[PDB]
Amino acid sequence: STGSATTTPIDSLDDAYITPVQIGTPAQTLNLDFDTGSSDLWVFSSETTASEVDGQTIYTPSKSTTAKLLSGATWSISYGDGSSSSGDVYTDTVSVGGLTVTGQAVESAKKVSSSFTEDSTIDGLLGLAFSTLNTVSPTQQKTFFDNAKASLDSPVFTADLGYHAPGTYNFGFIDTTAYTGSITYTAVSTKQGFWEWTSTGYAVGSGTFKSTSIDGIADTGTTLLYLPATVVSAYWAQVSGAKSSSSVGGYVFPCSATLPSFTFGVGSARIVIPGDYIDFGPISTGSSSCFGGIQSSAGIGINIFGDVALKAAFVVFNGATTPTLGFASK
Ligand SMILES: Nc1ncccc1CO
């Protein structure tokens, strides 16, 4: 089997991407944020505290003939950005792009933090990291990908995120029309439950490539590219008037600037992030200070290859016995 679904940016800055997912019988379609940095499939639901729902589509298990309470099971998650949600668990049929899993754990939110309530366009999360990070207790549950894997033509999914445009998530096959050149594969460590890999270095604009190992994770649910402070300072030093602002919470730059590209290494291959991808617009409406798409990872404890980076590439998440990541230009 295979599945193919279009992913659409929620706003004009590509802060996140939503992908329609069918849950239950008859289908309830919710728009979920596919997140390769976490391992819970959770939804706004009929059980969500009413004051914490503001425009989201909700899953109502009582209206699904295939929904079953997973008795006793609870979940609670906290994310890199301070947001959280918690609740109880149903099993139900879940379909993405034509690919169906029966008996998928659907985590129903009773509580969500303010950042979720405020995002009316995101009806929940579909986690695509390793199932070792799943928060269901007392019985940990599998991700949608882990449940689908055995049925798939190939044990893979691909992320093809658009710049200010829709893209695609594919399950079970590699669309050889979706990328240019070849795919370079690189080793993954699953020791922390993430798609953790080692970049081979970077370049700023037309500058020389610096060979240096940068461990990090490929995280579709993280907007920006977080890299060591040395690398980030080297990038922003090429933009006149850029500075790190403690008041704003990162590097900002004049919105009159033309930003240089950023290149990262994947083995002997190179992925180029155009400068425009690094512009996250005014810090506040009407400001002439713009927020940068490349930020320091110092304090976060890990480097994150978020959407600023992955949207520049066709990315293969290879879930074979020995997982690997693949990157191609597009
Ligand atoms: N990957 C993620 N998923 C959900 C919330 C936050 C992040 C990253 O901080």
| CA gap 272, 262 in Å, rounded | 6
* Spatial contact of 90 and 61, defined as CB atoms under 8 Å apart: yes
Angstrom CA distances, 120 to 18, 33, 287, stand at 11, 12, 25
CB 19 less than 6 A from any atom of ligand 1: no
* Spatial contact of 168 and 6, defined as CB atoms under 8 Å apart: yes
| CA gap 171, 139 in Å, rounded | 26
Q: Is residue 209 classed exposed, middle or buried when 0-12, 13-18 and 19+ CB atoms within 10 A define those classes? A: middle
User: Strand 289-292 and strand 250-254: pairing?
Assistant: antiparallel
Q: Which fold has domain 175-330?
A: Cathepsin D, subunit A; domain 1 (2.40.70)
Reduced to 3 states (helix: H, G, I; strand: E, B; else coil), residue 201 is: strand
Residue among 224, 272, 276, 285 nearest 251 (CA)? 224
The answer to whether 35 is a known catalytic residue is yes
| CA gap 29, 113 in Å, rounded | 22
CB 4 less than 6 A from any atom of ligand 1: no
Q: Is residue 57 classed exposed, middle or buried when 0-12, 13-18 and 19+ CB atoms within 10 A define those classes? A: middle
Computed on alpha carbons and rounded to an integer, the radius of gyration of the chain in Å comes to 20
| CA gap 218, 129 in Å, rounded | 10
Residue among 250, 223, 252 nearest 239 (CA)? 252
If you ran DSSP here, which 8-state letter would residue 257 be given? P
CB 66 less than 6 A from any atom of ligand 1: no
Mutate to test the pocket of ligand 1, among 40, 78, 79, 143 (most ligand atoms within 8 A of CB): 79
CB 113 less than 6 A from any atom of ligand 1: no
CA of 221 to the centre of ligand 1 (A): 5
Please indicate the experimental technique that yielded this structure.
Answer: X-ray
The answer to whether 81 is a known catalytic residue is no
Domain boundaries, the chain: 5-174, 175-330
| CA gap 256, 309 in Å, rounded | 23
| CA gap 327, 330 in Å, rounded | 10
User: Could you check whether 5-174 and 175-330 share the same CATH topology?
Assistant: yes
User: How many beta carbons lie within 10 A of that of residue 133, not counting itself?
Assistant: 18
CB 163 less than 6 A from any atom of ligand 1: no
CA of 232 to the centre of ligand 1 (A): 21
CA of 37 to the centre of ligand 1 (A): 7
CB 119 less than 6 A from any atom of ligand 1: no
CATH 2.40.70.10 fits 5-174, yes or no: yes
* Spatial contact of 203 and 210, defined as CB atoms under 8 Å apart: yes
What is the sign of the dihedral through the CA atoms of 214, 215, 219 and 225? negative
Which among 86, 95, 199, 261 is annotated as catalytic? Answer: 199
Rama region for 65: left / alpha / beta (φ>0; ψ in -120 to 50; rest): alpha
Q: How far is CA 139 from the centre of its chain?
A: 25
